[PDB]
Write a protein that binds this ligand. Structure first.
Ligand SMILES: CC[C@H]1OC(=O)/C=C/[C@H](C)[C@@H](O[C@@H]2O[C@H](C)C[C@H](N(C)C)[C@H]2O)[C@@H](C)C[C@@H](C)C(=O)/C=C/C=C/[C@@H]1CO[C@@H]1O[C@H](C)[C@@H](O)[C@@H](OC)[C@H]1OC
Ligand code: HEM
Ligand SMILES: [Cl-]
Length: 393
């Protein structure tokens, strides 16, 4: 009886037709994922939003449960495996340091970084791989700048960070060595910023307070590496997917060339439209029986709340499959919802807006250097995105 899940094909960004069918006829349904427990799948915008904001659906069981998932290993921990009130304390300290103003202040340095990466890419001649040379470089260098990793160390830090991408081809030994290097480096950096604070995020984390509460040494190190892995692969993959869309959809490209002031709205529209996850990814667990659209979800059972499907619900977004760069309103769930809503979103927005702005300004002719049908797509099974994007201009 449960349906085989995921439904999305990883070899492209199409939203599986099953989601729309289920939104009509079985909005709360049973799925059997490749690994982990069978689970409830929730597909309507209203219900996804409700699940992600409902106090009765928690993340703590992630720490021990056989979580519904697409890969054989379990990745657990960090802010996203915590529930209030433990979650609330850590999140309050982080956001006090990691402000929207701090994110906005990184725009000039993100633009300089993007310009340098295009310089480097263009110096390799055509076609050049936009994934290797740009998308996989900008977000980790911006996280370096955000944390306060000195310039001289961005290359080595970027190298270690590459080992944590779901697309990496590294042995267990190599990945272990990269993790050890990164945590040792970050622990040192924290220790130096406590002794001699600067204006960067690591210093602001060390000094964040709520009355007498503060982050411990171990919370600081875990949170800083947490920010890196949460803010790297997502952003990289979304850059790659957004430019893939601009290169393949002439009118979309034309509208942003002709009105670059549309880029921030376009970033929101493409965040809504792109079903970036292969599945849903972070199951919620009922703390008690809950009735959702007439179906009883029993205490303990996992629930997969599809933001990809929710963001394409025709009930919430008029003509939901059209990319309308000027769409208003646009209350999309592509940076989540409820207490776990993306705390890097302000920075992610600056990166994505800068990535489009600079690529379109420097390479307005940018296009696929190979037929679209020949693209190699990631089989990492977490996010959907091209493994390489050969581009010409
Ligand atoms: C696709 C995005 C996620 O990528 C991931 O989930 C990346 C997972 C990769 C695939 C893992 O690496 C693979 O592990 C296998 C055992 C072997 C395989 N090779 C070596 C043969 C190897 O490639 C994991 C275990 C790698 C390590 C370094 C790791 O823990 C990386 C985690 C990255 C998490 C990324 C972001 O998710 C964040 O996960 C946290 C656990 C959450 O708390 C939350 O962060 C705040 C979430 O970001 C919202
Ligand atoms: C295009 C890029 C990004 C997208 C699409 C994205 C999306 C998401 C989503 C959908 C969630 C909620 C996951 C859930 O509740 O299951 C999340 C949480 C999170 N994001 Fe992002 N994110 C992006 C970039 C970033 C960046 C740049 C950072 C750090 C600088 C960041 C840090 C985090 C953290 C720490 C969480 C966990 C929050 C919590 O559990 O309290 N993300 N993000
Ligand atoms: Cl850099």
């Amino acid at each position: 009886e449960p349906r085989a899940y995921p439904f999305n094909d990883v070899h492209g960004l199409t939203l599986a037709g099953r989601y729309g069918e289920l939104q009509e006829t079985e909005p709360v349904s049973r799925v059997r994922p490749p690994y982990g427990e069978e689970a409830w799948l929730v597909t309507r915008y209203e219900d996804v939003r409700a699940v992600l904001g409902d106090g009765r659906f928690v993340r703590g069981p992630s720490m021990t449960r056989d979580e519904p998932r697409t890969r054989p290993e379990m990745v657990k921990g960090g802010l996203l495996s915590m529930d209030p009130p433990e979650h609330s304390r850590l999140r309050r300290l982080v956001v006090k340091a990691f402000t929207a103003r701090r994110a906005e202040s990184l725009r000039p340095r993100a633009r300089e970084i993007a310009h340098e990466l295009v310089d480097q890419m263009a110096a390799t001649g055509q076609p050049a791989d936009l994934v290797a040379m740009f998308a996989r470089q900008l977000p980790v260098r911006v996280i370096c700048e955000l944390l306060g990793v000195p310039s001289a160390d961005h290359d080595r830090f970027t190298r270690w960070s590459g080992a944590f991408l779901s697309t990496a081809e590294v042995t267990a030994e190599e990945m272990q060595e990269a993790a050890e290097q990164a945590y040792a480096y970050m622990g040192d950096l924290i220790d130096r910023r406590r002794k001699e604070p600067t204006d960067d995020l690591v210093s602001a984390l060390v000094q964040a307070r709520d009355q007498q509460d503060s982050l411990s040494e171990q919370e600081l190190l875990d949170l800083a590496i947490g920010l890196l892995v949460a803010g790297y692969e997502s952003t990289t993959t979304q850059i790659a997917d957004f430019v893939y869309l601009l290169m393949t959809r002439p009118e979309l490209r034309r509208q942003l060339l002709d009105r670059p002031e549309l880029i921030p709205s376009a970033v929101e529209e493409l965040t809504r439209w792109v079903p970036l996850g292969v599945g849903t990814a972070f199951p919620r667990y009922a703390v008690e029986d809950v009735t959702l659209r007439g179906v009883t979800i029993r205490a303990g059972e996992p629930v997969l709340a599809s933001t990809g499907a929710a963001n394409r619900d025709q009930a919430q977004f008029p003509d939901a499959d059209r990319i309308d760069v000027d769409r208003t309103p646009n209350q999309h769930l592509g940076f989540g919802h409820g207490v776990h809503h993306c705390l890097g979103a302000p920075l992610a927005r600056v990166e994505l807006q800068v990535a489009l702005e600079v690529l379109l300004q420097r390479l307005p002719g940018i296009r696929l250097g190979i037929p679209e049908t020949q693209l190699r797509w990631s089989e990492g099974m977490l996010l959907r995105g091209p493994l390489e994007l050969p581009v010409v201009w």
